[PDB]
Amino acid sequence: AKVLVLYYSMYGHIETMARAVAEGASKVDGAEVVVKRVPETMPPQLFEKAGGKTQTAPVATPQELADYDAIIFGTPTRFGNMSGQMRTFLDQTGGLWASGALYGKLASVFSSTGTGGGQEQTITSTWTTLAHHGMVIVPIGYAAQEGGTPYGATTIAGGDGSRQPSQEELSIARYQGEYVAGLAVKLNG
Amino acid sequence: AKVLVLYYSMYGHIETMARAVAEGASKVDGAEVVVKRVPETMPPQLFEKAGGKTQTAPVATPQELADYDAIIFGTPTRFGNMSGQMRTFLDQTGGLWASGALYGKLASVFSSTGTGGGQEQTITSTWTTLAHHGMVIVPIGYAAQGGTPYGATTIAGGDGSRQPSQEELSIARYQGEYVAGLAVKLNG
Amino acid sequence: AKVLVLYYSMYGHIETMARAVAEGASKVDGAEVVVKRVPETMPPQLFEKAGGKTQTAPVATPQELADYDAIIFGTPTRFGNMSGQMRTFLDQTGGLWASGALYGKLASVFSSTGTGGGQEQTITSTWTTLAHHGMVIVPIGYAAQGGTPYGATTIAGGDGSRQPSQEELSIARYQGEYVAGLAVKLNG
Amino acid sequence: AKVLVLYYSMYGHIETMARAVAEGASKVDGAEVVVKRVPETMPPQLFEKAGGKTQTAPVATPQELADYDAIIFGTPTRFGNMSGQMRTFLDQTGGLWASGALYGKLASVFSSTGTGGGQEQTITSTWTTLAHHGMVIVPIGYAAQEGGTPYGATTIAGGDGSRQPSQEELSIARYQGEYVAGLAVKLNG
Ligand SMILES: Cc1cc2nc3c(=O)[nH]c(=O)nc-3n(C[C@H](O)[C@H](O)[C@H](O)COP(=O)(O)O)c2cc1C
Ligand SMILES: Cc1cc2nc3c(=O)[nH]c(=O)nc-3n(C[C@H](O)[C@H](O)[C@H](O)COP(=O)(O)O)c2cc1C
Ligand SMILES: Cc1cc2nc3c(=O)[nH]c(=O)nc-3n(C[C@H](O)[C@H](O)[C@H](O)COP(=O)(O)O)c2cc1C
Ligand SMILES: Cc1cc2nc3c(=O)[nH]c(=O)nc-3n(C[C@H](O)[C@H](O)[C@H](O)COP(=O)(O)O)c2cc1C
């Protein structure tokens, strides 16, 4: 099974989460895992001065999403929604929608926020788009307990962005990757 | 694989849909399908006076949900949420939650509305509860072609006179067949 | 302006919050505040055996909601939704809906959770129902500084032992005072 | 009271809706009404070939949103969310968020979809962002009935985009503008 971890990060928190997700998915016999980012939409000059952490992963094209059996989407919270960059990317998936290209594929979502507020809404409002594509949606449930959510792995970046993901947050992200990849093998070999 | 179509219905619209869902699921080789309803919470007297439709389906218990590989949940829209009867019932599943009893099982949702507005919120706000249980959620996507990609729906009309259409029931059957197919793929 | 704090609580966490909300609203010159609870739906015997907290607040009726200029609704999180007791109660407001009885009135929501997850969905899925009634919805935004901009919340802890904190109750009082201020501005 | 109708349109459906909203808000004694769009993010070449209807309204800056007492947001549905263009714009409102610049201002939302699916989610997922800004959220309720929603005015563009808004849809949009502007005067004079 092919698993895409597809993400947007501006300050590295989601990027770090993506790595943990991918490590988890890689644990699964039969799963092949790829990590990619959506294009930055900000001019580099502004991205630079805003203190952005330059992202170096291969940039995905909307078309290649059809190639995977499972897609795990990572986005930071922007006032309770996915980021503009992820929204702009997913708005380029009309071709795939028309052809049913993602229909029945596994989808799952992870996020990051400054202080907690909006993490749940970011994940569930992302599930909406995945459901229009006919994707099968995988939440994590009470995994953690067996300041997060049953909807997907999250991390807190802190008010000033200086917090880094904890071992426990990375563990939950890794679990999410492992579990989705396991589902993807059970369904697609 | 074992599939439960669990529904609430007060005027029979969700009941008609539930039957169609159960049929679609039945078409799948390897799938065993049961239809149950959640308990009415209205006193029988007021249900009657409200013009509520009486129903033959057996009443489910909260604890038996753990028996099934896939649960397809049917609720009418009540201002953009599931019904209080469905809500009350699911609030009784804390035991299953604690033991991880529904974790990883498939869930899917269908609904009915008077005039349309709220059918999407009903379905997605029911997904929320399914996700707390760690259920895998199955929307229907563009099979929905106003229906919804989130699951099958029917329009009851403002006075409730309208009955599920051929096309609406056909989408409902699609949904059962789709979820049942996934259940057999995952569980045999 | 008249403000109703309408709440459901099984272990007293939302009850404590409701009191604080009612106080904040009371601080507003021109605001008159009433606290009521929605009916328990559990039989008294099982409520008791469940370790439920008994409550002094008068029980509201669905129809009296139309009396108020602002309603602040308190519910614990039940897998990311309002409680079945709150859901059942609001399902009884079809009469108010038909007559436009709550249209334009202010609504605001607060909640309680065991461990946090679901508090945001509880609040926004309650807003849905308020919007069907045409109520104007008041979130609290960055006064929330894990709380939520959607309305005041408290963490009950996994075993329910934790009680609302000084800070959490202070946000709850802010919310009542804010909504009551808006009610007086709109209605005098 | 100053009322901003702030919108994104790619094929004109939301644009037509915006005009109706603005007409409604203008009916109100004491309300002054302005219509603006968010920047197109698409290169014009692509916008051209996709058959976009060039938008000609003044382009809003994130900063000027602080100047209004009420903002009515219009966006088409993109798989159950606001469009990338509106998301990208609202992601530039961090300055306003930090200063509480939109706190307590009135907000309301209208939408458009191809075939209905996702209109409710687009509106409520937009309310999320408005709530982070502390905005007071105004749905329309059962206005229509006294294929739409109580959350805000909507229009159906049809599967091929050829449908135009009906008189009844425009009437509901106008009502939304009138009602929000009326609220804005009652609160701010
Ligand atoms: C425009 C904008 C909106 C934001 N909204 C929220 C919010 O609603 N809640 C929150 O906790 N943090 C919010 N933040 C903080 C971001 O979520 C945080 O920077 C992000 O999680 C970091 O992830 P990254 O390092 O991968 O970019 C916001 C930040 C920006 C720039
Ligand atoms: C309390 C209550 C709230 C309702 N809210 C809505 C609504 O928000 N939108 C709508 O289109 N219909 C609404 N209706 C109509 C129901 O959705 C409709 O009667 C139901 O779908 C019929 O299904 P059933 O026959 O299976 O009970 C409501 C009905 C009641 C009794
Ligand atoms: C059926 C049920 C479901 C619950 N679901 C959640 C949940 O999803 N997330 C959470 O953090 N707590 C959950 N809890 C804990 C409640 O939110 C907690 O007991 C409540 O907030 C206490 O408020 P009260 O004392 O006012 O009743 C649940 C409790 C019950 C009984
Ligand atoms: C990327 C993309 C995603 C879309 N998703 C949906 C959808 O989920 N539901 C729907 O009915 N229409 C969908 N459509 C149709 C648009 O909503 C429609 O073009 C829009 O409402 C027209 O408004 P405008 O003329 O102002 O651009 C989508 C269109 C595009 C280009």
XYZ file of N, CA, C and O and ligand atoms in Angstrom, chain A residues 90-94 132, chain D residues 8-15 76-80 112-118 155 157, ligand 4:
143
model
N -5.958 22.010 -2.180
C -7.091 21.106 -2.291
C -8.117 21.709 -3.297
O -8.899 20.971 -3.867
N -8.120 23.026 -3.497
C -9.034 23.596 -4.480
C -8.555 23.271 -5.893
O -9.266 23.572 -6.831
N -7.387 22.632 -6.047
C -6.894 22.248 -7.375
C -7.149 20.771 -7.664
O -6.587 20.177 -8.631
N -7.993 20.139 -6.838
C -8.234 18.707 -6.968
C -9.590 18.394 -7.691
O -10.116 17.315 -7.566
N -10.153 19.382 -8.372
C -11.383 19.198 -9.149
C -11.344 18.114 -10.205
O -12.299 17.370 -10.352
N -16.125 14.856 0.420
C -16.595 15.206 -0.928
C -15.881 14.358 -2.000
O -16.440 14.055 -3.057
N -15.517 36.623 -2.332
C -14.749 36.010 -3.404
C -15.720 35.372 -4.418
O -16.643 34.616 -4.039
N -15.469 35.609 -5.707
C -16.238 34.974 -6.774
C -15.296 34.622 -7.914
O -14.414 35.415 -8.256
N -15.472 33.435 -8.486
C -14.718 33.061 -9.672
C -15.558 33.096 -10.969
O -15.017 33.348 -12.050
N -16.861 32.842 -10.855
C -17.740 32.778 -12.043
C -18.904 33.725 -11.958
O -19.852 33.566 -12.735
N -18.872 34.647 -10.978
C -19.867 35.673 -10.839
C -21.080 35.418 -9.948
O -21.851 36.348 -9.715
N -21.274 34.174 -9.466
C -22.494 33.838 -8.720
C -22.487 34.556 -7.369
O -23.508 35.143 -6.957
N -21.355 34.473 -6.658
C -21.226 35.174 -5.398
C -21.234 36.696 -5.621
O -21.790 37.414 -4.827
N -20.631 37.143 -6.713
C -20.594 38.554 -7.047
C -22.042 39.093 -7.141
O -22.360 40.150 -6.585
N -17.838 31.124 -2.441
C -18.425 29.895 -2.981
C -17.910 28.701 -2.168
O -16.886 28.804 -1.493
N -18.603 27.591 -2.276
C -18.211 26.360 -1.654
C -17.086 25.717 -2.453
O -17.144 25.597 -3.696
N -16.016 25.345 -1.746
C -14.940 24.527 -2.282
C -14.878 23.249 -1.422
O -14.254 23.246 -0.349
N -15.573 22.198 -1.864
C -15.661 20.938 -1.105
C -16.045 21.140 0.369
O -15.402 20.585 1.276
N -17.023 22.019 0.643
C -17.524 22.196 2.008
C -16.730 23.160 2.886
O -16.923 23.219 4.089
N -22.435 29.903 -2.263
C -22.923 29.391 -3.552
C -22.313 28.020 -3.741
O -21.155 27.803 -3.350
N -23.064 27.089 -4.332
C -22.543 25.786 -4.667
C -23.056 25.397 -6.042
O -24.015 26.000 -6.540
N -22.427 24.380 -6.623
C -22.825 23.771 -7.878
C -24.121 23.019 -7.777
O -25.040 23.244 -8.587
N -24.225 22.145 -6.778
C -25.392 21.276 -6.627
C -25.918 21.149 -5.199
O -26.583 20.173 -4.888
N -25.597 22.071 -4.302
C -26.147 21.965 -2.944
C -25.142 21.417 -1.953
O -24.954 22.012 -0.867
N -24.461 20.323 -2.319
C -23.610 19.622 -1.349
C -22.511 20.499 -0.767
O -21.700 21.091 -1.480
N -22.506 20.619 0.552
C -21.447 21.349 1.192
C -21.775 22.779 1.583
O -21.005 23.375 2.314
N -27.039 30.334 -3.145
C -27.508 30.185 -4.515
C -26.923 28.904 -5.110
O -25.829 28.411 -4.682
N -25.391 27.183 -8.466
C -24.797 27.606 -9.723
C -25.081 26.546 -10.818
O -24.823 26.780 -11.984
C -12.374 23.231 -6.435
C -13.878 23.284 -6.498
C -14.595 22.591 -5.525
C -16.002 22.616 -5.540
N -16.741 21.930 -4.577
C -18.097 21.952 -4.623
C -18.886 21.283 -3.666
O -18.407 20.668 -2.701
N -20.254 21.333 -3.760
C -20.875 22.008 -4.793
O -22.103 21.991 -4.890
N -20.116 22.677 -5.709
C -18.752 22.668 -5.640
N -18.051 23.386 -6.583
C -18.800 24.393 -7.426
C -18.607 25.820 -6.915
O -19.100 25.986 -5.609
C -19.271 26.856 -7.831
O -18.459 27.002 -8.958
C -19.415 28.203 -7.131
O -20.488 28.206 -6.231
C -19.743 29.343 -8.093
O -19.691 30.563 -7.421
P -18.871 31.793 -8.122
O -19.555 31.968 -9.465
O -19.095 32.994 -7.300
O -17.413 31.428 -8.367
C -16.669 23.333 -6.562
C -15.921 24.014 -7.529
C -14.547 23.988 -7.518
C -13.821 24.784 -8.623
